[model samples]
Target: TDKLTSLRQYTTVVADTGDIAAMKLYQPQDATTNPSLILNAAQIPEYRKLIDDAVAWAKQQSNDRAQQIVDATDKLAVNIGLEILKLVPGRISTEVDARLSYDTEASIAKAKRLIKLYNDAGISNDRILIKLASTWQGIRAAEQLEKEGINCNLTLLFSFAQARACAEAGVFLISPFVGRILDWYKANTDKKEYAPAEDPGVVSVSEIYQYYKEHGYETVVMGASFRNIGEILELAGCDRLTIAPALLKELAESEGAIERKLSYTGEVKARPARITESEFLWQHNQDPMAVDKLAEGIRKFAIDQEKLEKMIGDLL
Candidate 1:
């Protein structure tokens, strides 16, 4: 069997894109969307109507200029999410604005608003995962949301500290980025070649997976930001993998006997204690890669989000 089909035997495949065409083709179990992906999708001819509809609705809601743009952004995200849901039978993640990454209360408010938008459009909270950064504030916000029966997908996750906090907080899922980790090491050090087994990103996710499975923490681990198919293959038995469309197509076309590299029942060990706010801050500061990448991730997403809003503003 091809790698993609074989992978279904062990892991839930999630499409990490904003394009419904790709989702329909790959048929991932769940779909995830970010501001960057949404920005990219908004430029396409087919999706331009979603943008137009959001802008028109925003214009009608209020004449207040700033409020109009804000409401339009939210509506655009939900509209894209609603379209994605039509292509996939599972959940679709819509991210909160990265600008609210540090503000727990604001992030919570935005998340609730997004959920309400979805709920008002006949979608349930169960079918959505409100994507949030893995900052201390973001995790805390997710903790509160989960308690209210709203699920969350913690993104921009890089370290075990973030994973542990999310698990302790009872988050619904955590997206540990694999490719971005490898990118940091590759650019910072003299890393010429890496076997899938030895890749830093792969190793990071594997460690988190081991830690989660050993402690019997129920927070789902979905590896994200894969640089290549090797990283995905290395994490074959993860709870779920949110993959890009290009890699999904590669897997669909490749025929191979892929092995399960990770399992829940193998060599379970004692896990670390839950992280506190101070410790979470200290550990996050200690990891240079996580610190750099988390900040960079937020900045990049925020830029795209701003661009998207401006695009809508221009249309308005």
Candidate 2:
């Protein structure tokens, strides 16, 4: 049997791409899109109309040059998302602006605006997840959003502290990065590689999954940013795995025994009690990787978002 079909028995597979054709081919349950993915997709010849349409809509909405850029970017994300929704039966994730990462009010406002766009397009709230960074402010924004029926996907997560805080906030999902974590470790540590089970990224997600199941937390643990299929194989029983299209194809072609590595047993591992704001900040900072990665993640998104904005500017 093929690994992709085999893995589906335990995990809900997701496509982490902006390519609708790949989504149609891989047939993931849900799909996730970010500024980076949108930026990449916007450059393709086939998708130029989506970009052109968003800019025109943005110009109609505002005369302020800066506001048009913001409006166009948001609309483009939703336009891309609507296309993805046609292929996947489940929800599609559209990210909140990365530049708004630290401003709780702005993040909240932006999410509502995003939901309104989708609602106007006739898609229900159940089929859209507003993605935000896992910063303290982002979590706080998500906390309020969840109560108002705007579910969120807390992304760029790297540490146990981020996962714990996300659970406490009662978020819809978390994307604990697998490859980005490994990237940080490979550069910092002497050991170049390790078996999949022992890989730090896999270990981090495993601990978070076990901890979530043990404590009866309902927040879904989605292992994301996989470096290789080995990382994907290790987190086989995760609630969700947002994989690149290339890795998914590999799984479709490969044939062998792929074992379930994680499952919920009611054994409560010793974990620190509820994380307060001070504890979250301190504990998150205590791990240098989390701090560095979170910062880098935001900066990278900002860069991609800017690149897209520049492209939009030229078109207008």
Candidate 3:
């Protein structure tokens, strides 16, 4: 039963599922809150009190249809983030409006509101990771926010250019993906399975880890969105791994040695040159895998954000 215990010895673990019960079951140091996770959490009858409170609070604040749902969704997001914040000893990553993933200023504006919501609730900015997409605009937004003492989690990251950009920007962290990278390759290719090392997602994260460590960049690389225990275990020594509850339990039940797969030798590779915006787009566009996955990730979260918005409206 020490497979996971052994994994934690090398990297910090984070919870992908946001339900308080699921979180208590796996016991992760931090939790990431997203539109889909919040939508799922909002429907639970046991937490209806928490859900209802947000709507009730929203109704009192706004009379317009759009504004009411808007307020309620934001309120519910924090309502849940605050819930998780109470339990996890570490930070909670609350994201901006997914639909605004391309609009840096809009995303930053929304993130600022989320930060204020948490601050009003007495949580320090230190305890929050303002999760944003790793789009060019979003990266710029994170760079500006970092200057203001706001830590960010640049997610939907799939390309080396995105990693290098985030590293150069000196954002707080970046969540390189796992499942979706493989999903794209599976749909487009003949291969049905990949050994963990061969898993495109695993390989992407490893290279990103290598780049970060070799160059001495401090931005945390939190590997996310897993499909199996093998994929999770393969990245045993990533800076952090945010896993689903099912996989966490599976890892915990499997006992034996978990080998450390990544370590820096204190040998600094040459510091990477700054990546100009044109260079970033050119490089990312060069990688077909990164291009499709980044677009797909944006739409996936946007759809979920809309669904959650509708849910909040119905409840309101």
Candidate 4:
């Protein structure tokens, strides 16, 4: 069997792009879309229709041009997500505005709005995962949403503290970024001889996976932002791995024995102590990698979101 098929035997594969055709090619169990991916998709000729239709719908919603643009941008995200749902059999994650990362109330409200958009279009809440940054506020927002039957994907995750807090918050899932973690280490450290087994990114996700299993936390760990196939294989037995279309193609084409690298056994180490918000913040702050990467992830996503807004503005 190809590596992709072998990998599927152990982990649920999630497509990490906004391209419907690409997602259909791999048939990933779930799919995730972000502002950056959506912005990239909006520029594609085939996807221009989605933008146009959303803009047309927004035109009728309000007379204020600015409000129309805002409505249209959100409508466009749902429109894209709607199309993605047609191609994937499982859930589709639509992210909240990155600017709302720090505002718990705003993030929760935005998540509800997004979920309502999907619900209005005949999609059930079960098939949608609201994506948010793993900020303290973001986690808290997710906590509130999860209690109301909304599943959330706490993303831009980097540290154990973030993972533990999400688990404690009863988040539906968390995306611990693998490639970005490697990116930070590669730039800050002098070491360049990293291998799959020794990759810092791989080690980080593996630690989170083990911790989750050991504690019996139900929050799903979906590894994201892979730099290479090696990183994916290293965490083959993770709950889920959200892979880019290009890497999915690579895994589909390569022939190999994919090993199961992670799994939860009934026997586990004693559960770690639960942490309060202040404690979580302090623990996360102590790790410079987590602190820097979380900030960088938010800034980058916000920039892409702005770029996407500009595209919609020009269309208006």
Candidate 5:
């Protein structure tokens, strides 16, 4: 299952997990890390040592527990993110604190701080992508940061409005979550399982792809949160896909039976389609589905981020 044959044909492969060793083995073009991945790593026996060491380091470095924990997590995130960069030879998507999703100033501040930490640690601006929740405020913060030459990855994207807003903000990349879309669809579905093409997650990324390509938007689309190989195959020609190690291993173990899935040849370019600022906001606001889902997505990621932060505080 050399998805690279199909994925790289039109898009780039990005390792989705926090495992630097596996990332080195797969050699994805880029890497994405999140609070969940970092939190999960903190539980691993090997990484636990790193976490403990970080905690001790933080204690010696600061007096406040909250500040110490946040600083420690930042250091750990940068350390892991930078280590993974060695494997990808490209960029690493590191997230800003989720609790600041609605605080534009705080979001921008954290993004700058994180970028500085990475740069100070010998990583360059070109190799880091600040991951932000896809909220109106978050998009605005990313817009400000982009003008300063800081790249951003809009995460927890669930609706067209988020994509439109992110592109309008000139973000470097967008990660439209595939499995979470399918999760929402399944929760509303009468059945327990979904078919290949019939999957909502699959449809979400494809529509996002067409929207980005047809509209001539420079913001890259990276499909994240896959649940199966079927979803991976369905998004073959997307701008990029961040695949988990489990899926990578599944593909590596599979034989040559996998067939070509997606193509971008017949794509239509968005010519004569006006993209003024007012029109962009108006179009996004007009779509009630996009508007509601975008807000909901932001809230969810914000909650999860808080939970992860709480864990960091308790553990450290």
Candidate 6:
């Protein structure tokens, strides 16, 4: 009872996995899917048929192995994302190819295609968030998309500068990662362990939350990539959180007390903060964390995209 009780009081439960069985059980308010998660799910025996059939269908469509199979991957990923959306009442985030992160034009084109595909599947613009990397280029592309009524969620965000830039661009949402911050701290810091509140990831999101609330930013803050329950609890009052099923299970099982640690009031919301193109670029250049992470995240996603393409190539 405490688990559901806690979930009801403070947090918006979002399923982070691509597994439909788990999503049906946990019943998160929203669901998120990425290439890695889709790949992970594809490896499972239960999902093997879905993957194999998807590939087989692609082979029947065209002889271009790479084009047909990758198109099939996109179709499968979108189909699965839409299928999950049917279970949840809220929005679903379908990601673009990580390989396109560095190219703003390609990123926008892919995102537009995704939206069109989803719309063709009977999903609406209001129910989808095109997930893109948090690169400056990505943010710019999202800015362009956001103007066209396509809400974008900038993921792989680990820096305030990235947050500021996203805010400036008027993106619909930003997912500041909490667990990856702790991972970085653990490997680089002399201190081997940290309490939940002391988690670098938690702290990063906390700061972002307060800043956004205090300044009256319209962009939603979603704390993501959580490592533990403690981090989740620490961010209880966030706009949203994309949590893994394991942690959602932990929250749903507990009957413990949950507290609200973030809120907005007239005074805090009155604070002044704004940014423009020059300022956004200035902020991005200054925050080395965002700069490096932007580049690294792009490369990481690009490598995965290639891997995904290769997997399709072999299958077709």
Q: Which ranges of candidate 5 are over 4 A from the true structure?
A: 1-6, 56-61, 257-260, 266-316
Candidate 4, RMSD to the unseen true structure: 1.1
lDDT of 1 by residue, 168-280 (tens): 99999999999999999988889957889999999999999988888888899999998889999999999999999999999999998799998877665676666789998
Q: Which ten residues in a row have the lowest lDDT in candidate 4?
A: 265-274
TM-scores for all predictions: 0.97, 0.97, 0.97, 0.98, 0.86, 0.91
Candidate 5 lowest-lDDT run of ten: 255-264
Clashing residue pairs in candidate 4, if any?
A: none
lDDT (CA) per prediction: 0.93, 0.92, 0.89, 0.92, 0.79, 0.80
For model 1, what is the C-alpha lDDT against the true structure?
A: 0.93
Write the residue-wise lDDT of candidate 5 on 233-265 in tens digits: 777767788999999887766655445455555
Worst 10 residues of 1 by lDDT: 265-274
Report the error of model 1 at residue 246, Å. 0.4
Candidate number with the higher lDDT (4 or 6): 4
RMSD from true fold, candidate 2: 1.5
The alpha-carbon lDDT assigned to residue 97 of candidate 4 equals 94
Residue-level lDDT tens digits of model 2 in 1-316: 9999999999999999899988889899999988899999897788888888899999999999899988888889999999999999999999988999999999999999999989978999999999999999999999999999999999999988899999989999999998998999999999888899899999999999988998878899999898899999989999999999999999999998688989986666554577899988889999999999999999999999889888888777
Instruction: Give the 10-residue window scoring lowest on summed lDDT in candidate 3.
Output: 307-316
What's model 3's overall lDDT? Answer: 0.89
Off by over 4 Å in 3: none
- The TM-score of predicted model 2 comes to 0.97
Between candidates 2 and 3, the one scoring higher on lDDT is: 2
Please say which candidate is ahead in lDDT: 1 or 3: 1
Q: List ranges where model 1 is wrong by over 4 Å.
A: 266-273
